[PDB]
Design an enzyme around this catalytic site. Structure first.
Site, PDB file in Angstrom:
ATOM      1  N   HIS A  78      14.322  10.884 -17.151  1.00  0.00           N
ATOM      2  CA  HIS A  78      13.529  11.603 -16.179  1.00  0.00           C
ATOM      3  C   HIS A  78      13.354  10.711 -14.928  1.00  0.00           C
ATOM      4  O   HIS A  78      13.309   9.494 -15.034  1.00  0.00           O
ATOM      5  CB  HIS A  78      12.193  11.947 -16.843  1.00  0.00           C
ATOM      6  CG  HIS A  78      11.271  12.784 -16.028  1.00  0.00           C
ATOM      7  ND1 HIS A  78      10.605  12.298 -14.918  1.00  0.00           N
ATOM      8  CD2 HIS A  78      10.820  14.044 -16.219  1.00  0.00           C
ATOM      9  CE1 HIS A  78       9.821  13.244 -14.436  1.00  0.00           C
ATOM     10  NE2 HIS A  78       9.920  14.310 -15.212  1.00  0.00           N
ATOM     11  N   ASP A  88       9.885   5.617 -22.230  1.00  0.00           N
ATOM     12  CA  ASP A  88       9.257   6.837 -21.729  1.00  0.00           C
ATOM     13  C   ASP A  88       9.021   7.767 -22.894  1.00  0.00           C
ATOM     14  O   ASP A  88       9.970   8.347 -23.422  1.00  0.00           O
ATOM     15  CB  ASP A  88      10.144   7.509 -20.665  1.00  0.00           C
ATOM     16  CG  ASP A  88       9.544   8.796 -20.103  1.00  0.00           C
ATOM     17  OD1 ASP A  88       8.485   9.245 -20.582  1.00  0.00           O
ATOM     18  OD2 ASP A  88      10.142   9.351 -19.152  1.00  0.00           O
ATOM     19  N   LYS A 117       0.898  17.355 -21.599  1.00  0.00           N
ATOM     20  CA  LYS A 117       1.957  17.778 -22.549  1.00  0.00           C
ATOM     21  C   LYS A 117       1.472  17.594 -23.959  1.00  0.00           C
ATOM     22  O   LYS A 117       1.958  18.237 -24.883  1.00  0.00           O
ATOM     23  CB  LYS A 117       3.201  16.937 -22.332  1.00  0.00           C
ATOM     24  CG  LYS A 117       3.797  17.248 -20.957  1.00  0.00           C
ATOM     25  CD  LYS A 117       4.997  16.334 -20.639  1.00  0.00           C
ATOM     26  CE  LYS A 117       5.563  16.770 -19.283  1.00  0.00           C
ATOM     27  NZ  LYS A 117       6.858  16.088 -19.041  1.00  0.00           N
TER      28      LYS A 117
HETATM   29  C1  PLP Z   1       6.780  15.227 -17.920  1.00  0.00           C
HETATM   30  C2  PLP Z   1       7.709  13.931 -18.152  1.00  0.00           C
HETATM   31  C3  PLP Z   1       7.433  12.814 -17.394  1.00  0.00           C
HETATM   32  C4  PLP Z   1       6.301  12.753 -16.279  1.00  0.00           C
HETATM   33  O1  PLP Z   1       4.969  13.100 -16.619  1.00  0.00           O
HETATM   34  P1  PLP Z   1       3.838  13.126 -15.522  1.00  0.00           P
HETATM   35  O2  PLP Z   1       2.557  13.558 -16.213  1.00  0.00           O
HETATM   36  O3  PLP Z   1       4.239  14.102 -14.448  1.00  0.00           O
HETATM   37  O4  PLP Z   1       3.705  11.789 -14.861  1.00  0.00           O
HETATM   38  C5  PLP Z   1       8.249  11.682 -17.572  1.00  0.00           C
HETATM   39  N1  PLP Z   1       9.264  11.681 -18.539  1.00  0.00           N
HETATM   40  C6  PLP Z   1       9.541  12.761 -19.262  1.00  0.00           C
HETATM   41  C7  PLP Z   1      10.690  12.742 -20.290  1.00  0.00           C
HETATM   42  C8  PLP Z   1       8.758  13.936 -19.077  1.00  0.00           C
HETATM   43  O5  PLP Z   1       9.073  15.036 -19.861  1.00  0.00           O
END
Ligand code: PLP
Ligand code: PLP
Lengths: 399, 399
Positions: free
Chosen positions: B118, B195, B221
């Site tokens: 990402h 991540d 999320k």
């Molecule tokens: C959503 C996501 C992010 C970023 O999350 P934020 O809350 O916008 O900072 C980074 N990596 C992955 C794989 C994601 O799905």
């Protein structure tokens, strides 16, 4: 449009349980509108389908899309693209220091900072000064406990680049001559970082009239959500700023060779926004727009004046209050601050002591900490009587 | 005990209005515990007085004070001081790049970044490489569409310092062999940025077993509030990190000559926290802990498999799905993705198209964007039938 304190008070569900709440300068209670907009936001899908609450979902989207404009209306900003979402005043100021100043500061350059600044508008300048070999220059207080703006022509040199100045102190409630300071500053080609965390609440700055370069404030002090703040900047300065955090949403194209960005404000807002924060702040400002803030502030200040005049009749009293502020910083000689805070809470008065993130200001004032009762428009004459009686009771026990 | 999808479902007030909600990978619906904890927090004083709601106030404080520990329990972190609050995965990763890597990277050093990342775990590395004279080295995909960890011994050199690798892609749902990758990295004295914005939701990492240096994820999320995220780091790495934003709360002593800070995590958290965000995330984690995530996740994956198997019988179908993920990224040849998004919504199906903040990955897969249906444990067998039927009608109307 006449301000009615009882109508204002009626909107705050926390109030019945809160007792005499005199801690609004640390954080504000929330009106029902903020509570409800937030509940709705977490009780509805953020997707594109709405089987049964479409009407409500549309109202939330409208709140979200109008948020920047409501901030722009508060500040009399020329357009809503000069409004950048942050997590607070602190982030806002750090962004200016890192995204505007750092790539421009040369070794030997000078950053003038008022001795009255909250740590939010001091530590970032110390940090960037170390990073770049620049130097922080103290703007001292005058005999009236305000940053001595008339001294700026003596402190400004060919190396001065940045002025950091609070619109309003969170300790004294004092407001310096901001217009004059900006004139001196701009005469020398400097930019000004204005900390409005308190000013945005009591007398929101007209950023066009004052010719303010950057202005910062926090939502949670403005009857709003935690985790949300604002950075206003002139369009040309936001355009000139380097990007802040890297990631999604702030980028245009990305490859392993490098990346390009969106323009401002989006350039400066990587990642998923604090959507709940933006909506709730939008709700707070929309609710607030029904009230004349000058009238609301005069009410607050009046209560603080009644409180101060009564307390000054008690021996040992010392006030650090400026310009008949809503904020009343004080202590009693020979009495421990924390003892007084505790007794006051037990007698039902909510306030605080400590250094208020302003160590250099308190050192100039010659004290280690202060009590601070801050009055807001949901406060009452009864609240003043209760504060005074509670202080009398505390002093009996401690003195 | 055995996971019960119907019991999971009953806790989400948005679910009736949400229709068939297949966009959880972008953001998750919230359980009632999160809605209510947030309602209570905004409806009570955070001051030191409570005339009658002491029990409710004490519960909020208990949620707030336990929040770091609940994150630690999710990750099997050794203690709650290795947990740092941020506003999102994006901030977390920028913090590692700026506070750990930037002060240490030398010109000529190398940062290995997977092609599947990402933008949040790619753009900060491009940025800090530019700032330090370091270079970014791409880790490509293998034939299974996962970052090619088996290639790392060939890409690692004596100048390699940092590995940035997603635990789980938000496009393919693919999870590389993180343990092997970490073993290869640590052999070469590198630190790894993981991540976990998706992984934390589906396969929450045991950071001790995997020996992860840094781990990042986002609350929204994980069935939680917006504007809140986590950075986990080994205590020695948090301790070694420079401060992040400057200001109140992260500082201890301050003068116009310089400053000292609090220890980690507070060192890294300037300013008023997003208190509503922390409490709400705590509430989400306390609620989530009642469920076996392996069972809940295998339920979601099984729904995605039923969907994929069904859609693959329609001509023109193409899937980008890895490892029977809960995420189903797909395409239908000759049909605009956005047209399909719009018509599926008329059918009460909520999903999305676009680039998913992963341009280099899409370029590698040979496409400009993808549809993505993401399944969660509040989804059902009948949601799959509804999606498959909606796709048939959309194709009939668009083709
Ligand atoms: C959503 C996501 C992010 C970023 O999350 P934020 O809350 O916008 O900072 C980074 N990596 C992955 C794989 C994601 O799905
Ligand atoms: C409260 C305050 C700040 C800091 O606000 P945060 O929301 O904690 O970042 C900065 N300056 C002043 C004058 C304040 O009153």
């Amino acid at each position: 449009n006449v301000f009615n304190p009882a109508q204002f008070r009626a909107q705050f569900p926390a109030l019945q349980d809160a007792g005499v709440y005199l801690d609004s300068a640390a954080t504000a209670l929330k009106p029902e509108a903020v509570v409800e907009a937030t509940q709705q936001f977490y009780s509805l899908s953020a997707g594109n389908v709405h089987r049964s609450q479409f009407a409500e979902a549309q109202r939330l989207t409208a709140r979200y899309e109008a948020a920047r404009e409501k901030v722009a209306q508060l500040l009399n900003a020329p357009d809503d693209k000069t409004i950048v979402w942050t997590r607070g005043t602190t982030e806002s100021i750090n962004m200016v220091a890192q995204c505007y100043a750092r790539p421009r500061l040369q070794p030997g350059d000078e950053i003038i900072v008022s001795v009255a600044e909250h740590h939010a508008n001091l530590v970032p300048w110390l940090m960037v000064a170390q990073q770049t070999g620049a130097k922080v220059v103290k703007l001292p207080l005058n005999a009236q406990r305000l940053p001595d703006v008339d001294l700026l022509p003596e402190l400004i040199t060919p190396r001065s680049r940045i002025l950091a100045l609070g619109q309003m102190s969170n300790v004294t409630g004092g407001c310096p001559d901001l217009a004059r300071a900006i004139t001196f500053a701009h005469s020398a080609g400097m930019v000004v970082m204005v900390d409005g965390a308190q000013g945005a609440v009591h007398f929101p700055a007209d950023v066009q009239q004052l010719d303010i370069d950057f202005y910062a404030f926090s939502g949670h002090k403005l009857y709003g959500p935690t985790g949300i703040g604002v950075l206003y900047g002139k369009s040309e300065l936001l355009e000139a700023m380097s990007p802040w955090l890297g990631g999604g949403k702030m980028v245009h194209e990305v490859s392993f060779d490098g990346f390009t960005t969106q323009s401002a404000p989006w350039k400066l807002e990587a990642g998923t926004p604090n959507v709940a924060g933006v909506i709730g702040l939008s709700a707070a400002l929309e609710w607030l727009a029904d009230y004349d803030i000058n009238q609301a502030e005069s009410w607050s200040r009046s209560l603080a004046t009644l409180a101060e005049d009564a307390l000054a009749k008690r021996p040992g009293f010392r006030s650090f209050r400026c310009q008949d502020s809503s904020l009343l910083a004080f202590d009693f000689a020979g009495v421990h601050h924390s003892d007084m805070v505790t007794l006051l809470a037990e007698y039902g008065i909510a306030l605080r002591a400590g250094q208020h993130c302003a160590q250099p200001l308190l050192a100039e004032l010659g004290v280690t900490g202060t009590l601070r009762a801050s009055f807001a428009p949901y406060n009452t004459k009864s609240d003043v009587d209760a504060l005074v009686n509670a202080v009398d009771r505390a002093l009996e026990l401690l003195v």
